Enzyme design. Structure first.
Site: not given
Ligand code: HEM
Ligand code: HEM
Lengths: 296, 296
Positions: B141, B213
């Site tokens: 993450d 996601h």
């Molecule tokens: C339990 C809840 C969540 C988990 C486990 C999670 C996990 C992750 C993971 C594994 C990634 C891919 C790695 C990375 O590029 O950071 C990611 C990307 C991302 N997440 Fe989350 N996330 C969660 C909730 C959220 C929420 C609520 C939002 C927005 C309000 C969010 C916004 C984003 C964004 C903007 C990215 C970048 C994606 C990209 O541009 O490639 N996430 N998240």
């Protein structure tokens, strides 16, 4: 021989899991071997973390597992001081310590996959070393702890017999009332502990009240002091419950009993002065077998 | 200008404190200055800890303090999905982060001394970076998080106007059901996230479901990505409640909102596949002013 979690010094974080048996006691046999195997590869994977862990058992659970060979001194944690030190004796204790929170959590998760279907967790406490290794009260904690490997071995590790490589464990969670503590002047605090606060110099045992913490716990037998290995750490939240999670290892439970009897008034009617601001809310005794006898 | 806790990268631990105003709102003013002053002396004593903190305020609370100039997009967190994303809008959010748990706790205790009589804490969450910067699901993450200082400024800190130096904050505590996650095969989890699990490679937006996601949250406006600066960290206990404390800063609350609309069924009818194993249980919007406009 000895489990890896007893002897290491200067850990920065720890997890303590206290639990009762869920179902047949015999499932602890395979769960302990699985966790020890995982523990071993964790320790070789993260050498810089100085990872250690110990699995220990309560009286009834260990007697069924032993059984009932050795661990003579082990018994259910009684009371002390007429309820002043309560008893919350459980079946299984898992203590994980290292320099890193993230490694500790992977190990605690490994323990939960091994023991999940045979224990019911009662409390999981995350300890952390505070700034300058001070207790949340502001006093340095651990200065007179034994050090290092060979001395800590003779204090904490059973030398011979059926239980060779084993150890006895006492865990007790304290909840600090820092508002009540900051009532006392720094001098009054120093008389309560027995050492000066910011400087951590021992106050002479004649310019120091008999209720002081050091007078309570610095006990001698046959001219030799009753020593223990303390692995205690602060725990908790800034805005909520916080204090010290006390953890002690000793080759004989007797050393720990004598200090509880002194601290909580069952020896000379006097009580540890720290009860003016903090109180224990848990308490249990556990026997930690050798890593060998853990059948792993 | 900007508060110290928004931009720093690669923090190892964080403390989040969410609270309601206790008594009159005007007491926050001197409390914020008293804390931010102590904050600076903590940064001076620990210059190598990469310590930062931010104090942010809910809609009504900020509107009174503002008042009510600026924070045009600030509003109570709605939230989303007929309870799919619950709302627990509070008044005050304090976010502390650095490389050290012990430093963060001292800062958290300093905040409770400054704010203790004008806030009522609803939850205090202790975040920790896990092994390999992975979420407790085992997926890395933070990979596509903006880096570093210049780009994170562009994304998170308001540039022009009366709110210049400030930021909008969204906090949302999720609870992972790791039993339900480890139900799924690795390929199933990767199709849920949008990236390969072990190698953390982005799966192409053609080989992955629209409920993934990444597809939910990789959004564009005027051909330009809607970026946020996430500061989320794992939290919790091995045997009990654990998951991800989600936390993001953005120059416009609108970027966070659109990602919320998409994940929770309001944009496509489709919802985020991660709801198959984890659920949000808290939610709030906060406006973090500049350090100077914090009167501190
Ligand atoms: C339990 C809840 C969540 C988990 C486990 C999670 C996990 C992750 C993971 C594994 C990634 C891919 C790695 C990375 O590029 O950071 C990611 C990307 C991302 N997440 Fe989350 N996330 C969660 C909730 C959220 C929420 C609520 C939002 C927005 C309000 C969010 C916004 C984003 C964004 C903007 C990215 C970048 C994606 C990209 O541009 O490639 N996430 N998240
Ligand atoms: C809230 C609970 C406690 C607090 C805050 C506390 C604090 C301290 C402090 C500040 C010291 C002096 C620094 C050091 O040499 O380690 C100390 C020493 C010591 N404590 Fe504790 N303690 C607590 C509970 C206990 C309990 C329950 C025991 C025994 C059952 C114990 C056993 C000892 C021993 C043996 C020493 C070393 C005495 C010496 O030989 O100089 N402590 N403690």
């Amino acid at each position: 021989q000895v489990q890896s979690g007893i002897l290491p010094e200067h850990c920065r974080a720890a997890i303590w899991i206290e639990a009762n048996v869920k179902g047949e006691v015999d499932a602890l046999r395979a769960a302990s071997k699985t966790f020890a195997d995982k523990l071993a590869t964790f320790e070789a994977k993260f050498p810089d973390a100085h990872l250690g862990a110990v699995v220990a058992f309560g009286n009834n659970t260990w007697r069924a597992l032993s059984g009932g060979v050795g661990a003579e001194e082990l018994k259910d944690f009684p009371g002390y001081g007429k309820g002043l030190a309560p008893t919350t004796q459980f079946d299984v204790l898992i203590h994980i310590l290292s320099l890193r929170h993230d490694v500790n959590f992977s190990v605690a998760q490994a323990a939960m996959e091994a023991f999940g279907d045979c224990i019911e967790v009662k409390e999981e406490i995350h300890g952390f070393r505070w700034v300058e290794e001070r207790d949340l009260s502001g006093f340095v904690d651990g200065t007179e702890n034994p050090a290092g490997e060979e001395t800590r071995r003779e204090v904490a590790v059973i030398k011979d017999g059926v239980d060779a490589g084993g150890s006895y464990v006492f865990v007790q969670r304290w909840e600090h009332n820092l508002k009540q503590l900051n009532r006392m002047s720094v001098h009054d605090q120093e008389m309560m502990i027995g050492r000066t606060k910011e400087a951590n110099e021992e106050i002479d045992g004649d310019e120091r009240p008999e209720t002081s913490h050091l007078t309570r716990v610095d006990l001698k037998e046959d001219g030799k002091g009753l020593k223990i290995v303390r692995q205690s750490l602060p725990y908790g939240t800034a805005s909520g419950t916080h204090g010290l999670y006390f953890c002690a290892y000793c080759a004989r439970l007797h050393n720990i009993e004598q200090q509880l009897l002194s601290m909580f008034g069952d020896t000379d009617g006097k009580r540890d002065a720290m009860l003016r601001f903090t109180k224990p809310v848990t308490g249990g005794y556990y026997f930690a077998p050798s890593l060998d006898k853990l059948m792993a």
